[PDB]
Amino acid sequence: AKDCKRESNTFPGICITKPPCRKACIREKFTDGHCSKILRRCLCTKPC
Amino acid sequence: AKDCKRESNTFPGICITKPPCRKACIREKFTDGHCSKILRRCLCTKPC
Amino acid sequence: AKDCKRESNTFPGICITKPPCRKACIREKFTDGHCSKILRRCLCTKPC
Amino acid sequence: AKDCKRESNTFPGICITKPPCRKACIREKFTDGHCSKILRRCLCTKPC
Amino acid sequence: AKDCKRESNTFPGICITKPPCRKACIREKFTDGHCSKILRRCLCTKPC
Amino acid sequence: AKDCKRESNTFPGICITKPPCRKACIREKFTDGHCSKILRRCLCTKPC
Amino acid sequence: AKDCKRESNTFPGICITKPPCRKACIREKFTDGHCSKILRRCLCTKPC
Amino acid sequence: AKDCKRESNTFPGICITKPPCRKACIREKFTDGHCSKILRRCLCTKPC
Amino acid sequence: DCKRESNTFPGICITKPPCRKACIREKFTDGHCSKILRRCLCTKP
Amino acid sequence: AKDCKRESNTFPGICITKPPCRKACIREKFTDGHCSKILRRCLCTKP
Amino acid sequence: AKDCKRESNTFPGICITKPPCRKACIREKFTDGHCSKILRRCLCTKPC
Amino acid sequence: KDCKRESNTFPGICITKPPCRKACIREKFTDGHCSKILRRCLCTKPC
Amino acid sequence: KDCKRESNTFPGICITKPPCRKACIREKFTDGHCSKILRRCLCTKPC
Amino acid sequence: KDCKRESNTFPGICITKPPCRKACIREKFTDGHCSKILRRCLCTKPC
Amino acid sequence: AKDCKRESNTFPGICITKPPCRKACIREKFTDGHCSKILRRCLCTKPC
Amino acid sequence: AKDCKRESNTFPGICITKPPCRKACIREKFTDGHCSKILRRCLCTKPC
Amino acid sequence: AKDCKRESNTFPGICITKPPCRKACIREKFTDGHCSKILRRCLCTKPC
Amino acid sequence: AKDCKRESNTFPGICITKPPCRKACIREKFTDGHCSKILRRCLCTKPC
Amino acid sequence: AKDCKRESNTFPGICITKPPCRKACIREKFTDGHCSKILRRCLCTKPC
Amino acid sequence: AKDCKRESNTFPGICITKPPCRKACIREKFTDGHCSKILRRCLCTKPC
Amino acid sequence: AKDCKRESNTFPGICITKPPCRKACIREKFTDGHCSKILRRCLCTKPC
Amino acid sequence: AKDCKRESNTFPGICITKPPCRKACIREKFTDGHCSKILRRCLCTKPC
Amino acid sequence: AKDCKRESNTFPGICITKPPCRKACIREKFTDGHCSKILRRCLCTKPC
Amino acid sequence: AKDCKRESNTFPGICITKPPCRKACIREKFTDGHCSKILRRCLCTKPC
Ligand SMILES: CCCCCCCC(=O)OC[C@H](COP(=O)(O)O[C@@H]1[C@H](O)[C@H](O)[C@@H](OP(=O)(O)O)[C@H](OP(=O)(O)O)[C@H]1O)OC(=O)CCCCCCC
Ligand SMILES: CCCCCCCC(=O)OC[C@H](COP(=O)(O)O[C@@H]1[C@H](O)[C@H](O)[C@@H](OP(=O)(O)O)[C@H](OP(=O)(O)O)[C@H]1O)OC(=O)CCCCCCC
Ligand SMILES: CCCCCCCC(=O)OC[C@H](COP(=O)(O)O[C@@H]1[C@H](O)[C@H](O)[C@@H](OP(=O)(O)O)[C@H](OP(=O)(O)O)[C@H]1O)OC(=O)CCCCCCC
Ligand SMILES: CCCCCCCC(=O)OC[C@H](COP(=O)(O)O[C@@H]1[C@H](O)[C@H](O)[C@@H](OP(=O)(O)O)[C@H](OP(=O)(O)O)[C@H]1O)OC(=O)CCCCCCC
Ligand SMILES: CCCCCCCC(=O)OC[C@H](COP(=O)(O)O[C@@H]1[C@H](O)[C@H](O)[C@@H](OP(=O)(O)O)[C@H](OP(=O)(O)O)[C@H]1O)OC(=O)CCCCCCC
Ligand SMILES: CCCCCCCC(=O)OC[C@H](COP(=O)(O)O[C@@H]1[C@H](O)[C@H](O)[C@@H](OP(=O)(O)O)[C@H](OP(=O)(O)O)[C@H]1O)OC(=O)CCCCCCC
Ligand SMILES: CCCCCCCC(=O)OC[C@H](COP(=O)(O)O[C@@H]1[C@H](O)[C@H](O)[C@@H](OP(=O)(O)O)[C@H](OP(=O)(O)O)[C@H]1O)OC(=O)CCCCCCC
Ligand SMILES: CCCCCCCC(=O)OC[C@H](COP(=O)(O)O[C@@H]1[C@H](O)[C@H](O)[C@@H](OP(=O)(O)O)[C@H](OP(=O)(O)O)[C@H]1O)OC(=O)CCCCCCC
Ligand SMILES: CCCCCCCC(=O)OC[C@H](COP(=O)(O)O[C@@H]1[C@H](O)[C@H](O)[C@@H](OP(=O)(O)O)[C@H](OP(=O)(O)O)[C@H]1O)OC(=O)CCCCCCC
Ligand SMILES: CCCCCCCC(=O)OC[C@H](COP(=O)(O)O[C@@H]1[C@H](O)[C@H](O)[C@@H](OP(=O)(O)O)[C@H](OP(=O)(O)O)[C@H]1O)OC(=O)CCCCCCC
Ligand SMILES: CCCCCCCC(=O)OC[C@H](COP(=O)(O)O[C@@H]1[C@H](O)[C@H](O)[C@@H](OP(=O)(O)O)[C@H](OP(=O)(O)O)[C@H]1O)OC(=O)CCCCCCC
Ligand SMILES: CCCCCCCC(=O)OC[C@H](COP(=O)(O)O[C@@H]1[C@H](O)[C@H](O)[C@@H](OP(=O)(O)O)[C@H](OP(=O)(O)O)[C@H]1O)OC(=O)CCCCCCC
Ligand SMILES: CCCCCCCC(=O)OC[C@H](COP(=O)(O)O[C@@H]1[C@H](O)[C@H](O)[C@@H](OP(=O)(O)O)[C@H](OP(=O)(O)O)[C@H]1O)OC(=O)CCCCCCC
């Protein structure tokens, strides 16, 4: 069972590396964040 | 804009109608559930 | 669930990053904006 | 002036004709509803 | 509140982005213009 | 070389013949109505 | 050369035979009328 | 409804844009010209 | 040879003799029914 | 109505555009030529 | 946001529904099991 | 095979294996390799 | 409404209703009408 | 075929056969099946 | 409540009327035969 | 060539794989069963 | 529930009726032949 | 010299890779098997 | 086994019927040719 | 020009890189092998 | 095994058939020419 | 190696065919010009 | 006007930040070096 | 004045960066090599 997921509302650029997307997701009260594989979107995750 | 989303862990088959996927997601402590477009998965949603 | 969606009327080009589409949607009396997955269109959103 | 659009949360089955989807959308405080052409979803619309 | 629709009689090329189709429709006494997704036609709209 | 068209909101079933679709469109303040070719929808038309 | 063509505005039924479709076209200020191949529509023709 | 139409006799190739087919129709004593949807033919329209 | 649909034929073309006479009145040499649409198709040189 | 139609005999290729079939069909002593939509046959026509 | 993952060694066929793969993974000392999206493989998951 | 999971601690792009392998051992894994296309640091440990 | 079934005894194309109605009554039905498009003799009787 | 009629008690859209078959049995029919395109619950019984 | 269906192997033409197709199906030890709606095929039926 | 086929009367769900529909058809005194192409129906077959 | 199928090598035109396709298939050492539903191809069949 | 073709009677799942379908077709006394592009069916082949 | 395939090099037009493409492929020392379904290409086949 | 082409009969899974597909095709008496662009199949090539 | 390829600099229109594009590439000192699949471009090829 | 690329400053409309775009780039002191695949822009190239 | 653009020929790895790409482009006789949005390519820019 | 393109025959891995693809292309008697945009293939270029 993976965590929930919602695209970041504060991430401005194109998700290349994981640490930058995690930093923006933590502002949105998420526990982690990673880049989408194809569209390169910053996806925030949290235990649901 | 959306809310937190995750695939259903308890949905048995193909998601075609919404009520069967909604009832499975509410049992998983979610608020709603809808069918994915192509693979017809039962995606559970809840406010983040 | 999701918010109410509509395509932007003032967005100039191709939706590649979020900030250019969010600002164009906010000027259209919306609350947020994001890019369409394939056609890369600026989609304006706001709570129904 | 296109309306804002969102998929119905209450329409159970597959959208084939307009009246059943329009009934579920108007019940959700929307002004109209129509079927998607390929996937046959019930899309609710209301002015915005 | 869905608007009517008629293909533009003045659009000289292929509907690739929205602004040039919106401007060509306003000159035809229409209120909005959008591109058809497949054939890339400029479709004008107005309240009806 | 066409009129402004929009799908009917009151037509109950499948558009097979023209009169039943034309009557529902004139009631909707349109001038004429015809069946769509493939999906068999009642399309209301009126001069732009 | 080939005659100009337009679908009949006043044909009530399904274009099964040519005599009934031809009579309706002449009442619409046309010279002849024939049934379409697939969708069984009453097409009206006149010199051009 | 619609205007009486007939395929152009002088348009040289494939109908891609509207003005090139429109000009070939006005030279054939017509008022407008548009491209057919799938076969991409130059169709000449004029008021009946 | 050349082919054209009949304008004088009143109904569905089931047999050939009814369509053959209707085409001869149209100054054609023969008339036969289409395979599927059951139309009276006149033929002439 | 319609004009008398017959498949062209000189033109042996596949009817892609209208001008090539309209020209070669006339050289068979007809008045017009066009392409069939599906089979792309050069169909001759005359009154 | 994801657990430790490996393809099942005891799942015979192609993963279509979740219950068949989940039962095979638990017998392999795993906590869950889900189908891959494209290749439809039975992937077993357990907390790292 | 082993149990696989993407590294939570690798900072950049997985260019070579040793840097990702060390970062996975600090996450209590036994090995790590680069993803073939996206160049991610995937940690591996025996299940 | 009534229960519907295509006539098994009607010989040809359903052009007018009375010929199809007579054939349906012989099949222990109450009425029969021609279909819109295919012109079939469809029998009707109360379920 | 058997005498068919659309169900007057089936509320939604016919997708699977069991839910429509039960509605037709309550309507004094023997079986029920979905229409192929419109997905309507058709009730069948021996004429 | 249908019977066992199989397409005729002896019908030589297009299934226009039913008596010609029913006769050819009886020679194939089938009890009945009817025309298919769209493709106009001779379909032979018999109790399963 | 083909066998006599009739849609299954006891198949509860939707035909994705052959074994589930084959067992339902053998249960109905048929010899084999397969999934239809589009509507995913379970079709029972047996030698005529 | 079907026989082995391969398209005819010698069928000259469009498969409209069955006997012309069956004749060309039997000469090609097949037992039967029928038309393809849409593309109107002559398909030869023989027991595998 | 194209081989004859028939759908597999024994292949359970959905044809994604060739080895699973080739193995099932070989057990059915066919020489080869492959996946269909769109519907992902297992099709067996052997010399006619 | 399946035959080796290569597109025809001498076929002049658009592949509609099989005999024109088969004759062209045999003129190139292939054994058979067929028309591709969508783009209508003349494809030659020959045992590898 | 282009070589004769046939899908590999022995390639295990998804064609990501070329050398794994080349080695399998050379073993099958072909000269080279490359991956199909979308479906990622191993295609064996050799002079016709 | 594909030849060295470059788009034609002199081909005027949309590549439909091979001879017109092949003739233009021979003028440009190439050995062969074919039409691209989707965009219908004239691509000149020659041995590397 | 690769040349530099800049959009044409003088190309008026939409890049459908290559010859018009290549000629417009030579007037801008470039060596070649070609259309973009999707946006149909006239991209000029010359040795950088 | 717009500056010419070309991918770097000496930048050895994947770009993430701008300064490393600018230094590589200036060595290649360019005036600036920015990195592509998605593919992370070091693109060199200089006035045409 | 563009060059001729051909995919590398000897590039073993995924085309991530350009210098590795250039080396593989120069060994194949090409002048330069770059990575493809979507499929990340090593394309070799040389003057025609
Ligand atoms: C040439 C253009 C062609 C269009 C290319 C289509 C462009 C395209 O592929 O991106 C679209 C997007 C995928 O985008 P992307 O890969 O970046 O995002 C992934 C995707 O959302 C998965 O569904 C997620 O897994 P899950 O759901 O949480 O389990 C995954 O989350 P995670 O696992 O990483 O945490 C995400 O990374 O998905 C679609 O909408 C289907 C499009 C339908 C395309 C239908 C094609 C048959
Ligand atoms: C590249 C093509 C493939 C892309 C696949 C990408 C799959 C995917 O993500 O859904 C998109 C589409 C849904 O089609 P569908 O007609 O049901 O839904 C329409 C679609 O969402 C349009 O984008 C909407 O317009 P817009 O957004 O407001 O502008 C339109 O709203 P409106 O007109 O009523 O206002 C909707 O009706 O699906 C496919 O194209 C093929 C399905 C594949 C499986 C087919 C199974 C039958
Ligand atoms: C091959 C591409 C397929 C993608 C779909 C193609 C993309 C798409 O949007 O489809 C619309 C199509 C239209 O069908 P339909 O004939 O009913 O509607 C016609 C269509 O809107 C034309 O564009 C209209 O002309 P125009 O615009 O005013 O000039 C015409 O009006 P008029 O001329 O009579 O006045 C209308 O009659 O319906 C499907 O095929 C859905 C089948 C889905 C099957 C549902 C189950 C899966
Ligand atoms: C791939 C594109 C083709 C399909 C989509 C095409 C959809 C579309 O564009 O509508 C046109 C067609 C109307 O068919 P229909 O036979 O009623 O009308 C004919 C048609 O309009 C021809 O184009 C006319 O010739 P032309 O143009 O004036 O020279 C001809 O005039 P005439 O010369 O006889 O007097 C008319 O008779 O409708 C379908 O094909 C639906 C079949 C699908 C039904 C569903 C089947 C599953
Ligand atoms: C195989 C099944 C075919 C049966 C279906 C064939 C049915 C058929 O023959 O119609 C032509 C249609 C394409 O015609 P196309 O879309 O270009 O032209 C439209 C068509 O004529 C409509 O009927 C018109 O509406 P209406 O009627 O006046 O109201 C419409 O007028 P308008 O709206 O623009 O003003 C026209 O735009 O189909 C094909 O030929 C595709 C060939 C596929 C390629 C295969 C051949 C290589
Ligand atoms: C059916 C048709 C078959 C042909 C379609 C062939 C297209 C194709 O299938 O590719 C996808 C394939 C497997 O995809 P598939 O969706 O089955 O498996 C997913 C994939 O392994 C992800 O990487 C996993 O996420 P993550 O990494 O752990 O975060 C995910 O785990 P989880 O989300 O469940 O936790 C898995 O479900 O993997 C490739 O990249 C091959 C190179 C692609 C081609 C590269 C082109 C350059
Ligand atoms: C192939 C493309 C062209 C189609 C031409 C092919 C010819 C064609 O159009 O077939 C029509 C055929 C029968 O139509 P037909 O008019 O003969 O008979 C009517 C039909 O059975 C309706 O379903 C009934 O409605 P309902 O019982 O009251 O609910 C009606 O009952 P009633 O009211 O009289 O008592 C009957 O009269 O219906 C199909 O199978 C759907 C085909 C899909 C149509 C394709 C849509 C594009
Ligand atoms: C979802 C997209 C929207 C729908 C788009 C497609 C719209 C469309 O195709 O309509 C089909 C619909 C009936 O289709 P549908 O499959 O739902 O209903 C079947 C139909 O009534 C047959 O006639 C019945 O057989 P029969 O008669 O007893 O022998 C059959 O009974 P059974 O075998 O199950 O027991 C029924 O299941 O009604 C029309 O025919 C209108 C003519 C349409 C063409 C009009 C041309 C003028
Ligand atoms: C995805 C779009 C759908 C098209 C897919 C095509 C779907 C397909 O493969 O069937 C062919 C279809 C049916 O033809 P047709 O009406 O002659 O045959 C009927 C059909 O087999 C039904 O399934 C039968 O009911 P059931 O099964 O026993 O319950 C019915 O038996 P019954 O009830 O009378 O006893 C039969 O009458 O005709 C076309 O070609 C559509 C034009 C397609 C050409 C498209 C371009 C013009
Ligand atoms: C538009 C026309 C649709 C008519 C489809 C009518 C129903 C139908 O026939 O489906 C088959 C087709 C392709 O499906 P698919 O690729 O899985 O199967 C192939 C197809 O049957 C070809 O016809 C075969 O070649 P041939 O015949 O031996 O020459 C080929 O065999 P081979 O070459 O490998 O040996 C098969 O692999 O699917 C669709 O077009 C629409 C599905 C999209 C989803 C539908 C949802 C609505
Ligand atoms: C969207 C459907 C529209 C109809 C498309 C009908 C389906 C269809 O056309 O398949 C082919 C396509 C591409 O296949 P793919 O790219 O893997 O393989 C290429 C393809 O075979 C080309 O035809 C080859 O060129 P050519 O012939 O030698 O000149 C080329 O050879 P080369 O260049 O490498 O040397 C091959 O690489 O695969 C799909 O999209 C399946 C989507 C369905 C997936 C269903 C998943 C559920
Ligand atoms: C669905 C997306 C639509 C397909 C997109 C298909 C588009 C395509 O084929 O290549 C473009 C893109 C490269 O993106 P990338 O950002 O690296 O390169 C940009 C591109 O060159 C633009 O043209 C430049 O803008 P402009 O012209 O000078 O104004 C821009 O330079 P600048 O502005 O910074 O100076 C460059 O950054 O590649 C992919 O999409 C990766 C495929 C992964 C996803 C595959 C898609 C399924
Ligand atoms: C229309 C949908 C896509 C059809 C693809 C049909 C075409 C096809 O199969 O390959 C194209 C593309 C690979 O593109 P890729 O980026 O790898 O390679 C580029 C491509 O070959 C261009 O055509 C080249 O330009 P040109 O031609 O020389 O001018 C360009 O040369 P250069 O500029 O670098 O020097 C190359 O870099 O593959 C997909 O889009 C699959 C994405 C997912 C699609 C799968 C959807 C299910």
PDB file of N, CA, C and O and ligand atoms in Angstrom, chain R residues 37-38 40, chain S residues 38 41, chain T residues 2 5 34-41 43, chain U residues 2 37, ligand 11:
ATOM      1  N   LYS R  37      -2.195  -6.602 -31.618  1.00  0.00           N
ATOM      2  CA  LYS R  37      -1.693  -5.274 -31.270  1.00  0.00           C
ATOM      3  C   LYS R  37      -2.615  -4.559 -30.285  1.00  0.00           C
ATOM      4  O   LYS R  37      -2.154  -4.000 -29.283  1.00  0.00           O
ATOM      5  N   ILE R  38      -3.919  -4.565 -30.553  1.00  0.00           N
ATOM      6  CA  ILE R  38      -4.849  -3.708 -29.825  1.00  0.00           C
ATOM      7  C   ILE R  38      -5.560  -4.473 -28.716  1.00  0.00           C
ATOM      8  O   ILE R  38      -5.485  -4.091 -27.542  1.00  0.00           O
ATOM      9  N   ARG R  40      -4.895  -7.460 -27.672  1.00  0.00           N
ATOM     10  CA  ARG R  40      -3.939  -8.271 -26.916  1.00  0.00           C
ATOM     11  C   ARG R  40      -4.418  -9.716 -26.774  1.00  0.00           C
ATOM     12  O   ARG R  40      -4.409 -10.296 -25.686  1.00  0.00           O
TER      13      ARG R  40
ATOM     14  N   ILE S  38      -4.334   0.413 -42.539  1.00  0.00           N
ATOM     15  CA  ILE S  38      -4.580   1.830 -42.284  1.00  0.00           C
ATOM     16  C   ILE S  38      -3.917   2.692 -43.352  1.00  0.00           C
ATOM     17  O   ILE S  38      -4.598   3.401 -44.101  1.00  0.00           O
ATOM     18  N   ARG S  41      -0.305   0.349 -47.392  1.00  0.00           N
ATOM     19  CA  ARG S  41       0.989   0.082 -47.999  1.00  0.00           C
ATOM     20  C   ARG S  41       1.035  -1.338 -48.547  1.00  0.00           C
ATOM     21  O   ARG S  41       0.420  -2.258 -48.000  1.00  0.00           O
TER      22      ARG S  41
ATOM     23  N   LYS T   2      15.840  -1.105 -47.009  1.00  0.00           N
ATOM     24  CA  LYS T   2      15.511  -1.748 -45.746  1.00  0.00           C
ATOM     25  C   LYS T   2      15.560  -3.264 -45.903  1.00  0.00           C
ATOM     26  O   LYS T   2      15.287  -3.805 -46.977  1.00  0.00           O
ATOM     27  N   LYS T   5      12.184  -8.235 -42.364  1.00  0.00           N
ATOM     28  CA  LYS T   5      11.952  -8.060 -40.941  1.00  0.00           C
ATOM     29  C   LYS T   5      10.972  -9.105 -40.434  1.00  0.00           C
ATOM     30  O   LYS T   5      10.001  -9.442 -41.119  1.00  0.00           O
ATOM     31  N   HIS T  34      16.739  -4.921 -33.777  1.00  0.00           N
ATOM     32  CA  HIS T  34      16.502  -3.646 -33.117  1.00  0.00           C
ATOM     33  C   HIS T  34      15.128  -3.664 -32.465  1.00  0.00           C
ATOM     34  O   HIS T  34      14.281  -4.506 -32.774  1.00  0.00           O
ATOM     35  N   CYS T  35      14.914  -2.715 -31.560  1.00  0.00           N
ATOM     36  CA  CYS T  35      13.670  -2.641 -30.806  1.00  0.00           C
ATOM     37  C   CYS T  35      12.609  -1.874 -31.584  1.00  0.00           C
ATOM     38  O   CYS T  35      12.896  -0.844 -32.202  1.00  0.00           O
ATOM     39  N   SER T  36      11.382  -2.385 -31.551  1.00  0.00           N
ATOM     40  CA  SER T  36      10.255  -1.630 -32.074  1.00  0.00           C
ATOM     41  C   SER T  36      10.003  -0.411 -31.192  1.00  0.00           C
ATOM     42  O   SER T  36      10.189  -0.448 -29.972  1.00  0.00           O
ATOM     43  N   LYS T  37       9.576   0.681 -31.826  1.00  0.00           N
ATOM     44  CA  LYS T  37       9.594   1.979 -31.156  1.00  0.00           C
ATOM     45  C   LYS T  37       8.589   2.051 -30.012  1.00  0.00           C
ATOM     46  O   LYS T  37       8.915   2.543 -28.925  1.00  0.00           O
ATOM     47  N   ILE T  38       7.366   1.573 -30.230  1.00  0.00           N
ATOM     48  CA  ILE T  38       6.296   1.776 -29.258  1.00  0.00           C
ATOM     49  C   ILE T  38       6.071   0.521 -28.426  1.00  0.00           C
ATOM     50  O   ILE T  38       6.157   0.558 -27.193  1.00  0.00           O
ATOM     51  N   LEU T  39       5.771  -0.594 -29.089  1.00  0.00           N
ATOM     52  CA  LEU T  39       5.492  -1.836 -28.379  1.00  0.00           C
ATOM     53  C   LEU T  39       6.746  -2.507 -27.836  1.00  0.00           C
ATOM     54  O   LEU T  39       6.629  -3.494 -27.101  1.00  0.00           O
ATOM     55  N   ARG T  40       7.931  -1.999 -28.179  1.00  0.00           N
ATOM     56  CA  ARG T  40       9.200  -2.475 -27.624  1.00  0.00           C
ATOM     57  C   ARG T  40       9.400  -3.967 -27.883  1.00  0.00           C
ATOM     58  O   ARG T  40       9.717  -4.744 -26.979  1.00  0.00           O
ATOM     59  N   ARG T  41       9.206  -4.367 -29.135  1.00  0.00           N
ATOM     60  CA  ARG T  41       9.440  -5.736 -29.565  1.00  0.00           C
ATOM     61  C   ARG T  41      10.811  -5.849 -30.218  1.00  0.00           C
ATOM     62  O   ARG T  41      11.323  -4.887 -30.796  1.00  0.00           O
ATOM     63  N   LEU T  43      12.842  -6.959 -33.156  1.00  0.00           N
ATOM     64  CA  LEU T  43      12.619  -7.221 -34.572  1.00  0.00           C
ATOM     65  C   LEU T  43      13.923  -7.693 -35.202  1.00  0.00           C
ATOM     66  O   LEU T  43      14.931  -6.980 -35.156  1.00  0.00           O
TER      67      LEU T  43
ATOM     68  N   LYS U   2      18.884   0.583 -42.187  1.00  0.00           N
ATOM     69  CA  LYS U   2      18.288   1.679 -42.936  1.00  0.00           C
ATOM     70  C   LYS U   2      19.367   2.549 -43.569  1.00  0.00           C
ATOM     71  O   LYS U   2      20.463   2.713 -43.027  1.00  0.00           O
ATOM     72  N   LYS U  37       5.403   8.123 -42.563  1.00  0.00           N
ATOM     73  CA  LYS U  37       4.136   7.460 -42.263  1.00  0.00           C
ATOM     74  C   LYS U  37       3.044   8.459 -41.890  1.00  0.00           C
ATOM     75  O   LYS U  37       1.963   8.460 -42.491  1.00  0.00           O
TER      76      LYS U  37
HETATM   77  C1  LIG Y  11      -4.105   3.675 -31.149  1.00  0.00           C
HETATM   78  C2  LIG Y  11      -4.500   2.593 -32.151  1.00  0.00           C
HETATM   79  C3  LIG Y  11      -4.631   3.209 -33.542  1.00  0.00           C
HETATM   80  C4  LIG Y  11      -4.527   2.099 -34.585  1.00  0.00           C
HETATM   81  C5  LIG Y  11      -3.069   1.660 -34.700  1.00  0.00           C
HETATM   82  C6  LIG Y  11      -3.014   0.181 -35.075  1.00  0.00           C
HETATM   83  C7  LIG Y  11      -1.994  -0.538 -34.195  1.00  0.00           C
HETATM   84  C8  LIG Y  11      -0.619  -0.463 -34.853  1.00  0.00           C
HETATM   85  O1  LIG Y  11      -0.474   0.145 -35.860  1.00  0.00           O
HETATM   86  O2  LIG Y  11       0.472  -1.114 -34.269  1.00  0.00           O
HETATM   87  C9  LIG Y  11       1.703  -0.549 -34.610  1.00  0.00           C
HETATM   88  C10 LIG Y  11       2.122   0.411 -33.500  1.00  0.00           C
HETATM   89  C11 LIG Y  11       3.609   0.723 -33.626  1.00  0.00           C
HETATM   90  O3  LIG Y  11       4.338  -0.448 -33.418  1.00  0.00           O
HETATM   91  P1  LIG Y  11       5.946  -0.303 -33.103  1.00  0.00           P
HETATM   92  O4  LIG Y  11       6.314   1.159 -33.016  1.00  0.00           O
HETATM   93  O5  LIG Y  11       6.251  -0.980 -31.788  1.00  0.00           O
HETATM   94  O6  LIG Y  11       6.806  -1.015 -34.315  1.00  0.00           O
HETATM   95  C12 LIG Y  11       7.047  -0.276 -35.488  1.00  0.00           C
HETATM   96  C13 LIG Y  11       5.923  -0.555 -36.493  1.00  0.00           C
HETATM   97  O7  LIG Y  11       5.802  -1.949 -36.662  1.00  0.00           O
HETATM   98  C14 LIG Y  11       6.200   0.095 -37.854  1.00  0.00           C
HETATM   99  O8  LIG Y  11       5.211  -0.304 -38.771  1.00  0.00           O
HETATM  100  C15 LIG Y  11       7.572  -0.302 -38.413  1.00  0.00           C
HETATM  101  O9  LIG Y  11       7.819   0.451 -39.573  1.00  0.00           O
HETATM  102  P2  LIG Y  11       7.664  -0.285 -41.038  1.00  0.00           P
HETATM  103  O10 LIG Y  11       6.282  -0.880 -41.158  1.00  0.00           O
HETATM  104  O11 LIG Y  11       8.699  -1.377 -41.163  1.00  0.00           O
HETATM  105  O12 LIG Y  11       7.880   0.726 -42.138  1.00  0.00           O
HETATM  106  C16 LIG Y  11       8.707  -0.045 -37.414  1.00  0.00           C
HETATM  107  O13 LIG Y  11       9.883  -0.614 -37.932  1.00  0.00           O
HETATM  108  P3  LIG Y  11      11.299   0.206 -37.743  1.00  0.00           P
HETATM  109  O14 LIG Y  11      11.100   1.655 -38.117  1.00  0.00           O
HETATM  110  O15 LIG Y  11      11.734   0.111 -36.301  1.00  0.00           O
HETATM  111  O16 LIG Y  11      12.357  -0.403 -38.629  1.00  0.00           O
HETATM  112  C17 LIG Y  11       8.430  -0.659 -36.037  1.00  0.00           C
HETATM  113  O17 LIG Y  11       9.412  -0.206 -35.137  1.00  0.00           O
HETATM  114  O18 LIG Y  11       1.876  -0.181 -32.258  1.00  0.00           O
HETATM  115  C18 LIG Y  11       0.801   0.401 -31.579  1.00  0.00           C
HETATM  116  O19 LIG Y  11       0.675   1.579 -31.575  1.00  0.00           O
HETATM  117  C19 LIG Y  11      -0.212  -0.479 -30.851  1.00  0.00           C
HETATM  118  C20 LIG Y  11      -1.189   0.409 -30.082  1.00  0.00           C
HETATM  119  C21 LIG Y  11      -2.259  -0.458 -29.423  1.00  0.00           C
HETATM  120  C22 LIG Y  11      -1.830  -0.790 -27.995  1.00  0.00           C
HETATM  121  C23 LIG Y  11      -3.009  -1.386 -27.229  1.00  0.00           C
HETATM  122  C24 LIG Y  11      -2.654  -1.484 -25.746  1.00  0.00           C
HETATM  123  C25 LIG Y  11      -3.883  -1.926 -24.956  1.00  0.00           C
END
